[PDB]
Amino acid sequence: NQSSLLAEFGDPITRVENALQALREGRGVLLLDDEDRENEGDIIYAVESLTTAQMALMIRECSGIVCLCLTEAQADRLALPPMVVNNNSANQTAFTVSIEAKHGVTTGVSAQDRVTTIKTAANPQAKPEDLARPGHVFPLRARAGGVLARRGHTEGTVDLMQMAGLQPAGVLCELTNPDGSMAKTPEIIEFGKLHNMPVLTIEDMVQYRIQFDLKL
Protein backbone atom coordinates (compact mmCIF):
# COMPACT_ATOMS: atom_id res chain seq x y z
CA ASN A 1 0.00 0.00 0.00
CA GLN A 2 0.99 3.67 -0.21
CA SER A 3 1.04 4.50 3.51
CA SER A 4 3.36 1.52 3.94
CA LEU A 5 5.53 2.43 0.95
CA LEU A 6 6.06 6.00 2.14
CA ALA A 7 6.80 4.91 5.72
CA GLU A 8 10.52 4.85 4.94
CA PHE A 9 10.36 8.58 4.19
CA GLY A 10 9.08 8.94 7.77
CA ASP A 11 5.67 9.54 9.28
CA PRO A 12 3.38 12.18 7.73
CA ILE A 13 4.63 15.07 9.87
CA THR A 14 8.22 14.07 9.18
CA ARG A 15 7.56 13.77 5.46
CA VAL A 16 6.31 17.36 5.43
CA GLU A 17 9.18 18.70 7.54
CA ASN A 18 11.76 16.97 5.38
CA ALA A 19 10.17 18.40 2.23
CA LEU A 20 10.18 21.92 3.65
CA GLN A 21 13.84 21.65 4.67
CA ALA A 22 14.79 20.37 1.21
CA LEU A 23 13.12 23.40 -0.40
CA ARG A 24 14.91 25.75 2.03
CA GLU A 25 18.15 24.10 0.91
CA GLY A 26 17.29 24.73 -2.73
CA ARG A 27 16.51 21.08 -3.47
CA GLY A 28 13.44 19.60 -5.10
CA VAL A 29 10.68 17.40 -3.69
CA LEU A 30 8.22 14.87 -5.10
CA LEU A 31 4.53 15.48 -4.35
CA LEU A 32 1.83 12.85 -4.84
CA ASP A 33 -1.84 13.78 -4.93
CA ASP A 34 -4.64 11.45 -3.82
CA GLU A 35 -4.60 7.91 -5.16
CA ASP A 36 -8.20 8.45 -6.34
CA ARG A 37 -7.37 11.76 -8.06
CA GLU A 38 -4.48 11.98 -10.52
CA ASN A 39 -2.36 9.48 -8.57
CA GLU A 40 0.68 11.23 -10.01
CA GLY A 41 3.90 12.48 -8.55
CA ASP A 42 5.20 15.89 -9.55
CA ILE A 43 8.71 17.17 -9.16
CA ILE A 44 8.46 20.50 -7.33
CA TYR A 45 11.11 23.18 -7.11
CA ALA A 46 11.14 26.60 -5.51
CA VAL A 47 11.45 29.41 -8.05
CA GLU A 48 13.76 31.39 -5.72
CA SER A 49 16.58 28.87 -6.10
CA LEU A 50 15.69 27.43 -9.52
CA THR A 51 18.66 26.56 -11.73
CA THR A 52 19.07 25.56 -15.35
CA ALA A 53 20.20 22.10 -14.24
CA GLN A 54 17.01 21.63 -12.22
CA MET A 55 14.88 22.71 -15.20
CA ALA A 56 16.85 20.38 -17.48
CA LEU A 57 16.13 17.49 -15.13
CA MET A 58 12.40 18.28 -15.18
CA ILE A 59 12.41 18.39 -18.98
CA ARG A 60 14.45 15.17 -19.25
CA GLU A 61 12.50 13.18 -16.65
CA CYS A 62 9.01 14.69 -16.66
CA SER A 63 6.21 15.48 -19.12
CA GLY A 64 8.09 18.59 -20.25
CA ILE A 65 4.98 20.71 -19.73
CA VAL A 66 6.54 22.66 -16.90
CA CYS A 67 4.06 24.76 -14.92
CA LEU A 68 4.56 27.86 -12.78
CA CYS A 69 2.35 27.85 -9.68
CA LEU A 70 1.42 31.39 -8.63
CA THR A 71 -0.82 32.97 -6.08
CA GLU A 72 -3.98 34.62 -7.40
CA ALA A 73 -2.41 37.98 -6.50
CA GLN A 74 0.70 37.38 -8.59
CA ALA A 75 -1.28 36.09 -11.58
CA ASP A 76 -3.50 39.18 -11.33
CA ARG A 77 -0.45 41.46 -11.12
CA LEU A 78 0.80 39.84 -14.33
CA ALA A 79 -2.60 40.20 -16.05
CA LEU A 80 -2.86 36.45 -16.66
CA PRO A 81 -6.52 35.46 -16.91
CA PRO A 82 -7.52 31.80 -17.24
CA MET A 83 -6.67 30.36 -20.63
CA VAL A 84 -10.29 29.25 -21.07
CA VAL A 85 -13.43 30.90 -19.77
CA ASN A 86 -15.42 27.66 -19.35
CA ASN A 87 -12.83 25.19 -18.08
CA ASN A 88 -14.09 21.63 -18.62
CA SER A 89 -10.85 19.80 -17.87
CA ALA A 90 -11.41 16.93 -15.42
CA ASN A 91 -9.76 18.67 -12.43
CA GLN A 92 -10.41 22.25 -13.57
CA THR A 93 -6.63 22.77 -13.75
CA ALA A 94 -6.20 26.55 -13.55
CA PHE A 95 -4.06 27.22 -16.61
CA THR A 96 -3.63 30.86 -17.49
CA VAL A 97 -2.49 31.98 -20.93
CA SER A 98 1.04 30.63 -21.57
CA ILE A 99 3.96 33.02 -21.18
CA GLU A 100 7.44 33.86 -22.46
CA ALA A 101 9.86 36.36 -21.02
CA LYS A 102 9.65 39.39 -23.30
CA HIS A 103 13.41 39.93 -22.93
CA GLY A 104 16.40 37.74 -22.19
CA VAL A 105 15.34 34.63 -24.13
CA THR A 106 15.32 33.42 -27.71
CA THR A 107 12.83 30.65 -28.64
CA GLY A 108 11.76 30.20 -25.01
CA VAL A 109 12.05 26.42 -24.76
CA SER A 110 15.63 25.89 -23.62
CA ALA A 111 16.04 25.06 -19.95
CA GLN A 112 17.74 28.41 -19.40
CA ASP A 113 15.01 30.30 -21.26
CA ARG A 114 12.26 28.67 -19.22
CA VAL A 115 14.04 29.65 -16.03
CA THR A 116 14.40 33.24 -17.28
CA THR A 117 10.68 33.38 -18.02
CA ILE A 118 9.79 31.84 -14.65
CA LYS A 119 11.99 34.23 -12.66
CA THR A 120 10.59 37.15 -14.71
CA ALA A 121 6.99 36.14 -13.99
CA ALA A 122 7.60 35.34 -10.29
CA ASN A 123 9.36 38.66 -9.64
CA PRO A 124 7.33 40.49 -6.94
CA GLN A 125 7.88 43.68 -8.99
CA ALA A 126 6.85 42.18 -12.31
CA LYS A 127 4.50 43.95 -14.67
CA PRO A 128 2.33 42.43 -17.42
CA GLU A 129 4.56 43.86 -20.19
CA ASP A 130 7.51 41.82 -18.91
CA LEU A 131 5.90 38.68 -20.43
CA ALA A 132 4.96 37.88 -23.99
CA ARG A 133 1.93 35.66 -24.61
CA PRO A 134 1.74 32.88 -25.75
CA GLY A 135 4.85 31.05 -24.74
CA HIS A 136 6.40 27.91 -23.33
CA VAL A 137 5.87 28.27 -19.56
CA PHE A 138 2.39 27.40 -18.24
CA PRO A 139 1.23 29.33 -15.17
CA LEU A 140 -1.37 27.93 -12.83
CA ARG A 141 -3.46 29.93 -10.34
CA ALA A 142 -3.45 28.38 -6.87
CA ARG A 143 -6.77 28.68 -5.02
CA ALA A 144 -6.98 30.79 -1.89
CA GLY A 145 -6.66 28.46 1.07
CA GLY A 146 -4.23 26.12 -0.64
CA VAL A 147 -4.56 22.42 -0.04
CA LEU A 148 -7.21 23.14 2.59
CA ALA A 149 -9.41 24.48 -0.25
CA ARG A 150 -8.29 22.41 -3.25
CA ARG A 151 -6.28 19.18 -3.05
CA GLY A 152 -4.22 19.90 -6.18
CA HIS A 153 -0.48 19.84 -6.84
CA THR A 154 -0.90 23.53 -7.73
CA GLU A 155 -2.00 24.38 -4.20
CA GLY A 156 0.53 21.97 -2.76
CA THR A 157 3.33 23.77 -4.57
CA VAL A 158 2.42 27.26 -3.36
CA ASP A 159 1.66 25.99 0.17
CA LEU A 160 5.05 24.25 0.40
CA MET A 161 6.85 27.48 -0.50
CA GLN A 162 4.82 29.49 2.03
CA MET A 163 5.27 26.86 4.75
CA ALA A 164 9.03 26.85 4.09
CA GLY A 165 9.20 30.64 4.30
CA LEU A 166 10.08 31.01 0.62
CA GLN A 167 8.67 33.36 -1.97
CA PRO A 168 5.27 31.89 -2.89
CA ALA A 169 6.06 30.58 -6.37
CA GLY A 170 7.17 27.13 -7.43
CA VAL A 171 7.40 24.97 -10.52
CA LEU A 172 5.98 21.51 -11.06
CA CYS A 173 6.06 18.78 -13.67
CA GLU A 174 4.73 15.23 -13.74
CA LEU A 175 7.26 12.43 -13.41
CA THR A 176 7.18 10.24 -16.52
CA ASN A 177 8.65 6.77 -17.06
CA PRO A 178 10.87 6.33 -20.13
CA ASP A 179 8.20 4.37 -21.98
CA GLY A 180 5.91 7.40 -21.70
CA SER A 181 3.61 6.08 -18.99
CA MET A 182 3.30 8.16 -15.84
CA ALA A 183 5.33 7.21 -12.80
CA LYS A 184 3.40 5.63 -9.97
CA THR A 185 4.38 5.46 -6.35
CA PRO A 186 7.11 2.77 -6.52
CA GLU A 187 8.86 4.58 -9.39
CA ILE A 188 8.41 7.95 -7.64
CA ILE A 189 9.96 6.55 -4.47
CA GLU A 190 12.89 5.11 -6.41
CA PHE A 191 13.38 8.40 -8.28
CA GLY A 192 13.40 10.31 -4.98
CA LYS A 193 16.02 7.99 -3.53
CA LEU A 194 18.12 8.30 -6.68
CA HIS A 195 17.94 12.10 -6.69
CA ASN A 196 17.87 12.65 -2.92
CA MET A 197 14.41 14.25 -3.10
CA PRO A 198 11.87 13.85 -0.28
CA VAL A 199 8.47 12.36 -1.15
CA LEU A 200 5.25 13.48 0.49
CA THR A 201 1.55 13.58 -0.30
CA ILE A 202 -1.22 16.17 -0.40
CA GLU A 203 -2.90 14.27 2.43
CA ASP A 204 0.29 14.72 4.45
CA MET A 205 0.13 18.46 3.84
CA VAL A 206 -3.57 18.76 4.71
CA GLN A 207 -3.30 16.98 8.06
CA TYR A 208 -0.10 18.91 8.78
CA ARG A 209 -1.73 22.26 8.03
CA ILE A 210 -4.81 21.38 10.11
CA GLN A 211 -2.96 20.15 13.18
CA PHE A 212 -0.49 23.05 13.31
CA ASP A 213 -3.11 25.40 12.70
CA LEU A 214 -1.37 26.83 9.73
CA LYS A 215 -3.05 29.70 7.97
CA LEU A 216 -1.02 31.01 5.06
The answer to whether residue 159 forms part of the interface with ligand 5RP (CB under 6 A) is: no
Considering only 67, 163, 183, 206, the residue that binds ligand 5RP (CB under 6 A) is: 67
60 carries a ligand binding annotation: no
User: Taking the alpha carbons of 100, 105, 106, 108 in that order, is the dihedral positive or negative?
Assistant: negative
The answer to whether residue 38 forms part of the interface with ligand 5RP (CB under 6 A) is: yes
The answer to whether residue 126 forms part of the interface with a second copy (CB under 8 A) is: no
Q: Work out how close the CB of 116 gets to ligand 5RP at its nearest, in angstroms, rounded to a whole number.
A: 16
Measure CA of the first residue to CA of the last residue in the chain; give whole Å. Answer: 31
CA–CA dist 149, 135 (Å, integer): 29
- CA angle (93, 95, 97) in 5-degree steps: 165
Contact region with ligand 5RP (CB under 6 A), list: 75-83, 117-125, 148-156, 162-170: 148-156
The answer to whether residue 112 forms part of the interface with ligand 5RP (CB under 6 A) is: no
Task: Report what 124 binds from ligand 5RP, a second copy, none; CB cut-off 5-8 Å by kind.
Answer: none
Residue 119: is it exposed, middle or buried by C-beta count within 10 angstroms (0-12/13-18/19+)? middle
Contact region with ligand 5RP (CB under 6 A), list: 20-28, 71-79, 149-157, 175-183: 149-157
Considering only 56, 59, 65, 216, the residue that binds ligand 5RP (CB under 6 A) is: 65
Q: Work out how close the CB of 67 gets to ligand 5RP at its nearest, in angstroms, rounded to a whole number.
A: 5
CA–CA dist 23, 109 (Å, integer): 25
For residues 15 and 160, the answer to whether their CB atoms sit within 8 Å is no
Edge-first strand listing for the sheet containing 170-174: 99-101, 131-141, 67-70, 170-174, 41-46, 29-32, 199-201
Q: What are the DSSP calls for 24-53, one per residue?
A: HTT--EEEE--TTTT--EEEEEESTT--HH
- Compose the 169-188 pattern: x for residues touching ligand 5RP by CB under 6 A, - for all others: ---x-x--------------
**Chain positions contacting a second copy, by CB under 8 A:** 38, 40, 52-53, 55-56, 59-60, 62-66, 83-84, 87-90, 93, 95, 97-98, 100, 102, 106-112, 132-136, 174, 176, 178-182
